Write a protein that binds this ligand. Structure first.
Ligand SMILES: [Ca+2]
Ligand SMILES: [Ca+2]
Ligand SMILES: [Ca+2]
Ligand SMILES: [Ca+2]
Ligand SMILES: [Zn+2]
Length: 316
């Protein structure tokens, strides 16, 4: 809407207070005009019609329980926008400052969050498996990264290309979490998953096997469930990215870590310059090796480490 840019204050899903960019026109709307062509957050009102209503508030204060998921969806979209712009010189998900839209309170007891090809959508969870999913910065960044991928490599959401698609989202979700620097880790969704259970998460990049996901190509799922196991076989690529960054010895193969920033550069370059809709794991390895070569030279530690990592997870 047309209005004047203002700054509201509220509390997110985890009870933390934060400032949010709003727009004033009779009501204060969750519309951040400070980033690209805007970040807009909507209320789906427990229904499944999208996007729902642009979030409107009478007093620019967002401390109600019902406000929390909106506060976080709006704020974390901003953090993710900042990451891509500051770190990768990318303006929004399309590289041309596309408006970022999110709807919260999607359906009832909905234990998921997703990019639908046009916008972000967040369930509130059922309070047992999940609390409102926009509470997880890694979740927000994971799903916005699907938009980036759709505008770039366009990895088909099935089989190996789909698992790469998922891993890319886990990788950048995690790098955004580190960028925000609040309790960062190599786990996915820990902030909103199972409020009744401490120390768990949906997936682990450092040890995918913790939740029964493969950490080696020899253990890949080849059935038809989950679009050919896109959320399962992503563990193989997640483990490789973790190894590239942090190092380690995996099934007896040693990897020299090169750190998160260089991991981010290599994979962002792979995603935007080399990967295609049909890329498989072997082709991802080649793309990452070529990216690291472009960035650091063929004789670099960075290239050697990428090779070691993919070797360690059995991807040739
Ligand atoms: Ca209010
Ligand atoms: Ca964390
Ligand atoms: Ca995490
Ligand atoms: Ca938990
Ligand atoms: Zn996903």
């Amino acid at each position: 809407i047309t209005g004047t840019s203002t700054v509201g204050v509220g509390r997110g899903v985890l009870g933390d207070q934060k400032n949010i960019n709003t727009t004033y026109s009779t009501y204060y709307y969750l519309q951040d005009n400070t980033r690209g062509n805007g970040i807009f957050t909507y209320d789906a009102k427990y229904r499944t019609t999208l996007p729902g209503s642009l979030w409107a508030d009478a007093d620019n204060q967002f401390f109600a329980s019902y406000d929390a998921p909106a506060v976080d969806a709006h704020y974390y979209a901003g953090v993710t926008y900042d990451y891509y712009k500051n770190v990768h010189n990318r303006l929004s998900y399309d590289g041309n400052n596309a408006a970022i839209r999110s709807s919260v309170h999607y359906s009832q007891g909905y234990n998921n969050a997703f990019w639908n090809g046009s916008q972000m959508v967040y369930g509130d969870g059922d309070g047992q498996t999940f609390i409102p999913l926009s509470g997880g910065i890694d979740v927000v960044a994971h799903e916005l990264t699907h938009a980036v991928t759709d505008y770039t490599a366009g990895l088909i959401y099935q089989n190996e290309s789909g698992a790469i698609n998922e891993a890319i989202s886990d990788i950048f979700g995690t790098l955004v979490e580190f960028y925000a620097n609040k309790n960062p880790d190599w786990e996915i969704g820990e902030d909103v998953y199972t409020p009744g259970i401490s120390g768990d998460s949906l997936r682990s990049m450092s040890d995918p096997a913790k939740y029964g996901d493969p950490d080696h190509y020899s253990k890949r799922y080849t059935g038809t469930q989950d679009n050919g196991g896109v959320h399962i076989n992503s563990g193989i690529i997640n483990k490789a990215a973790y190894l590239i960054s942090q190092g380690g010895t995996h099934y007896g193969v040693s990897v020299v870590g090169i750190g998160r920033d260089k991991l981010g550069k290599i994979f962002y370059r792979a995603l935007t310059q080399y990967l295609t809709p049909t890329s498989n794991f072997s082709q991802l390895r080649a793309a990452a090796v070529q990216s690291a070569t472009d960035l650091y030279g063929s004789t670099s530690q960075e290239v050697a480490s990428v090779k070691q990592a993919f070797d360690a997870v059995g991807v040739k």
